[model samples]
Target: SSVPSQKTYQGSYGFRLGFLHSGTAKSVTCTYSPALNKLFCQLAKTCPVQLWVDSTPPPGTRVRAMAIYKQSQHMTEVVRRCPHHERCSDSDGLAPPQHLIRVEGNLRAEYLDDRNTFRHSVVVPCEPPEVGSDCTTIHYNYMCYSSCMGGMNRRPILTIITLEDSSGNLLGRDSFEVRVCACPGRDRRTEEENLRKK
Candidate 1:
């Protein structure tokens, strides 16, 4: 047997601020769908929830060397993505079932630094989940980057492809928390509250 070869393409490059929508939606429906991928969620403390909005790669997204340093969530495993790095491909429309790599954005937009503070990057041949068969391709990659200025409180909303079908039907999604739930609590000073706090 032979492994399928991979191809890379210009991911994307732009400044974006994902929509963090919440509050009584004028029309409230207490229904929740698993397809809703939450880019950002409620924090345990007052720590800022930095979300992944956009990247610099025009053909594709580059999630390499992307990090942020602050007085609090400073390079201490603050923000991360489950599966990172995807191959570059030029799909006019969507992608085939088995061939399409469903990309999901675990991070949100608020975390992005308008000043281009954090770096954006990705790797090739992303690591697949070590469980049931996941819809993935040979060149799929995930990334965490900043579109604009990074900040807290501001919840930027975003989503990504999670599941797909044999007919090229893409599904699955991210989850976003509520507003009241995502706030600067008493334990806001998270860096110091960490178990490995210095």
Candidate 2:
């Protein structure tokens, strides 16, 4: 018997980010749903979150990385299509819905510079079992503001990261489906447990 191999070539360039420890900066796993094309992670209320991005850029090309927060229709659609709609909708009845505020003006510029922008050059390391690298890879940090959270009580938002040329042409993009809650791991645990039971 043999297990089928999963495809590794998502694209020539792409973006990925995950939660990290404040001191050591090690990555924490976040739940990924292939069906929805989204990655899910939990956050605590009013606490500043640090995220790291692993980006592959086109060889010998310079690009600017930017991140923007916006409401996620993808997440809302998932909830709407759930078989247990009542349970999903009712789970957040205890709290009123909260929306994520958009950044703008001087604050927005500062925010982008401090957290979202990635402007550095580094060596391209090869991963085992893969051929020679085609592009350079850079690891950088981004900020997930304390106000960004999503659940039944609050609207979910997407943290979209994009790489663009000097003329603003997009080269690559990716995003994270964020849910801020007290117990972030519980949802994924119960989801897997239920899947096995079925």
Candidate 3:
């Protein structure tokens, strides 16, 4: 058997953020369906929860590289197909069972600057658009320092990813967190790898 190989790495050093939606809805039900490989939920607001990738790479002293991995998910279906063609009213359109309800959103990243400001990137595009619906890619590679590089350069790095609808309405938000480590780069890599392992 062969082990997986690293296709490529755009190395960088920084703390990254990810989303784990902790928001509520007006009058909705959210649940994961094993059969659909999706989270089916009834919604007043069709906005779905966002995913986060929190990071904590070192501060202000980089070889200056960015390593990003591709991520994606499927879009929601308005209707499922009818199992029994003759018995069903609509063959192409059915209720929950076939036409599963799922959430969708656009993803982008925002970083906290040295001056306690915000710097945002373009609307990151996801591959296989419809199949990987409501998706985006992100990365923030810069030179920075952690304890190993002298804590004096230490500053705050916040990662925020927003999940919004096509109408530009926000459904929910997610935040990425970097766990503590003695060295910025060292631990930052660990954090990201751990996420992929999941």
Candidate 4:
């Protein structure tokens, strides 16, 4: 319950796109301490990242100060990822009913030692799901989306799956960040009421 001091000097600022951990930040909060490894550089972005901690902050402190863009290391435990909400306006039903999505998950890493996984043209093939394969499938095809940030935003494909254990050791790592947003045709008063009836 002690780790505070810095009253002025905030960042001898280097931030090569790193330093973002804030569970709110009142007396400096930047986390990811598997017993002190990295991250929590006293705050980087909008400045204010000072911490000397002489009291308080010791109960696994964290507050939330968003600076998102790859925050932790080792893929942060193979990327568990969160946030799964589906909501789009314009009457909805744009990306529903599927567009060639057969996801069981795991792909990207070319095969050589004979593990195989890749489908190409926006494909993902992560093999190792044959032993009673519980939903084995990783196909893809959807490399496009318009409407920019309004339709929300899409296109950030990232599918990492590394599960080695036949003597490779590490046996777990699954990541998926496939975004594809595109559904906008109304609002703006229905395109200005069809251009005021032309």
| Model number with the top TM-score | 2
Q: lDDT of all predictions, in order shown?
A: 0.24, 0.32, 0.26, 0.25
lDDT of 4 by residue, 1-198 (tens): 121111222122211112234432334322322222222222111222222222222222221111111222322221111222223221122222211121212233121211232121112222323576332333222212311342213222333333333343322333323222321112222333555687
* Stretches > 4 Å off in candidate 1: 1-124, 128-152, 159-198
Query: What is the Cα-based lDDT of residue 33 in candidate 4?
Result: 23
Clashes by residue pair, model 2: none
Which candidate's lDDT is highest? Answer: 2
In the range 47-140, model 3's lDDT, one tens digit per residue, is 2333222232222211111111112111111111123322334322212122211112322321111122122122232222135544322322
C-alpha RMSD in Å of predicted model 4 compared with the true structure: 21.5
- TM-scores for candidates 1 onward, in order: 0.20, 0.36, 0.25, 0.18
Q: Residue by residue across 110-160, what tens digits does model 1's lDDT show?
A: 122213422222222222323673222222221222221232222332222
| TM-score for candidate 1 | 0.20
Candidate 1 C-alpha error for residue 189, in Å: 27
Relative to the true structure, candidate 3 reaches a TM of: 0.25
lDDT of 4 at 18: 20
To one decimal, what is the Cα RMSD in angstroms of model 3 from the true structure?
21.0
